[PDB]
Amino acid sequence: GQIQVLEGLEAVRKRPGMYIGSTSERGLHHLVWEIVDNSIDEALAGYANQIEVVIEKDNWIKVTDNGRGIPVDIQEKMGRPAVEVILTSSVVNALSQDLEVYVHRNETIYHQAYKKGVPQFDLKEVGTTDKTGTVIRFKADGEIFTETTVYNYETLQQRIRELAFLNKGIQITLRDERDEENVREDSYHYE
Ligand SMILES: Cc1[nH]c(C(=O)Nc2nc3c(OCCN4CCOCC4)cc(C(=O)O)cc3s2)c(Cl)c1Cl
Numbered sequence: 001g002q003i004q005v006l007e008g009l010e011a012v013r014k015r016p017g018m019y020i021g022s023t024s025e026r027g028l029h030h031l032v033w034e035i036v037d038n039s040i041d042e043a044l045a046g047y048a049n050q051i052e053v054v055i056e057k058d059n060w061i062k063v064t065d066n067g068r069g070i071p072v073d074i075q076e077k078m079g080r081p082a083v084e085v086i087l088t089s090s091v092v093n094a095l096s097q098d099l100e101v102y103v104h105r106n107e108t109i110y111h112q113a114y115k116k117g118v119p120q121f122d123l124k125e126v127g128t129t130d131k132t133g134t135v136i137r138f139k140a141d142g143e144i145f146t147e148t149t150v151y152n153y154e155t156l157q158q159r160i161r162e163l164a165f166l167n168k169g170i171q172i173t174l175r176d177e178r179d180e181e182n183v184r185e186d187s188y189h190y191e
């Protein structure tokens with residue numbers, strides 16, 4: 001089961017273009033669409049209505065939603081927490097030099113970190129919460145995206161606006177914190 005995950009990570013990193021269309025600027029932006037798409041599905045299921053995308057210093061991406069939280073219960077299949085099984089089959093995780101999850105669920109904050117899809121430690125309880133949702137922070141792997149790992153605000157802005165227009169009732173916010181002296185935000189909420 002865990003042998004199958006490792007071969008999956010090797011497959012994705014060996015032929016990344018077969019998975020995300022290209023390793024160009026187009027492929028770098030595709031990472032964000034892959035994560036945001038999961039949060040939109042949680043909203044269409046009726047459980048989330050807010051998504052926030054932050055370009056952080058050094059072109060980290062953080063996506064946050066107010067969904068149920070990715071589940072943390074032990075799979076009978078992997079013997080591992082569900083969230084670990086979901087993220088260690090994620091293309092985004094495989095093509096990120098680092099990725100972090102924080103889950104707010106069961107009044108608990110759970111945390112795991114990964115490098116090229118490989119968990120760095122077991123899922124751990126780190127805090128308490130009265131909210132539910134998921135935070136993902138990732139840094140695209142410079143070894144995969146050799147052309148650029150720099151996001152284009154206007155590219156993200158155009159697609160986030162389109163997603164909010166198509167999926168009415170979802171508040172979707174983009175914020176660029178790369179320059180701490182000049183922070184730019186656009187927030188879309190149709191109907
Ligand atoms: C940023 C973000 N948010 C989510 C997210 O909230 N996903 C989420 N998935 C799930 C989920 O599915 C488990 C695994 N898969 C089912 C079949 O499609 C794909 C997911 C179950 C529950 C629940 O049973 O309470 C909650 C949740 S909340 C994911 Cl994944 C990412 Cl990445």
Ligand SMILES: [Ca+2]
Nearest residue numbers: 037038041042
């Ligand atoms: Ca889905």
Ligand SMILES: [Cl-]
Nearest residue numbers: 071072073105
């Ligand atoms: Cl759970």
